[PDB]
Design a protein around this ligand. Structure first.
Ligand SMILES: [Ca+2]
Ligand SMILES: [Ca+2]
Lengths: 65, 144
């Protein structure tokens, strides 16, 4: 009932994760538990992936509208 | 719009996905990066990611496409309204406002499921007045 709810949340969540990752001391950087010392090459790939995931969540939100 | 330094950081970013160095990023290259970060994507996730960036349709991403993506001004690019429309899904009044508690529920328990630490920053930056009701149209402007 209302598939717009998961897509809505995911669009906001990805938009904010993309925004917060511009601050390199954000708590959003703590979620990669499986990496020991977050180096700067991790951060460059993480920001690309987050941008890619935001554009996907944008797509699936538009699709549910 | 784009510095010579921004393009260079983007080229270094492109190099970290293009392991083989052929100048394109395949879905399998992206899955290797994502698993190195502790993610476990499926082939369809990776294809969804690639199809949003691939402009010609070959199923792989070259540096012009990667740069087009990384430099898309996600702020005025009609994105503000879709995030509003996203927030409106949970605004059961038209209030333009959403309780901090409702927000924490939706953010922590649905969709991507954010961490409680992450929902602290979000709620903290967005509750301008500090009474437990955030107005999402101001938060939208802040993210953009
Ligand atoms: Ca390659
Ligand atoms: Ca291509």
């Amino acid at each position: 009932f209302n598939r717009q709810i998961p897509a809505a949340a995911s669009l906001i969540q990805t938009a904010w994760r993309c925004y917060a990752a511009e601050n390199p001391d954000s708590s959003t950087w703590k979620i990669y538990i499986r990496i020991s010392q977050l180096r700067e090459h991790h951060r460059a790939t993480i920001k690309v992936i987050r941008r890619m995931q935001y554009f996907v969540a944008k797509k699936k939100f538009q699709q549910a509208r | 719009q784009l510095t010579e330094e921004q393009i260079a950081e983007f080229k270094e970013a492109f190099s970290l996905f293009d392991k083989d160095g052929d100048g394109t990023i395949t879905t399998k290259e992206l899955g290797t990066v994502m698993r190195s970060l502790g993610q476990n994507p499926t082939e369809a996730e990776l294809q969804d990611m690639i199809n949003e960036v691939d402009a010609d349709g070959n199923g792989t991403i070259d540096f012009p496409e990667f740069l087009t993506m990384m430099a898309r001004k996600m702020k005025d690019t009609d994105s503000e309204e879709e995030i509003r429309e996203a927030f409106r899904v949970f605004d059961k009044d038209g209030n333009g406002y959403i309780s901090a508690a409702e927000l924490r529920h939706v953010m922590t328990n649905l969709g991507e499921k954010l961490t409680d630490e992450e929902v602290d920053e979000m709620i903290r930056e967005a509750d301008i007045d500090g009474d437990g009701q955030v107005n999402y149209e101001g938060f939208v402007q802040m993210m953009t």
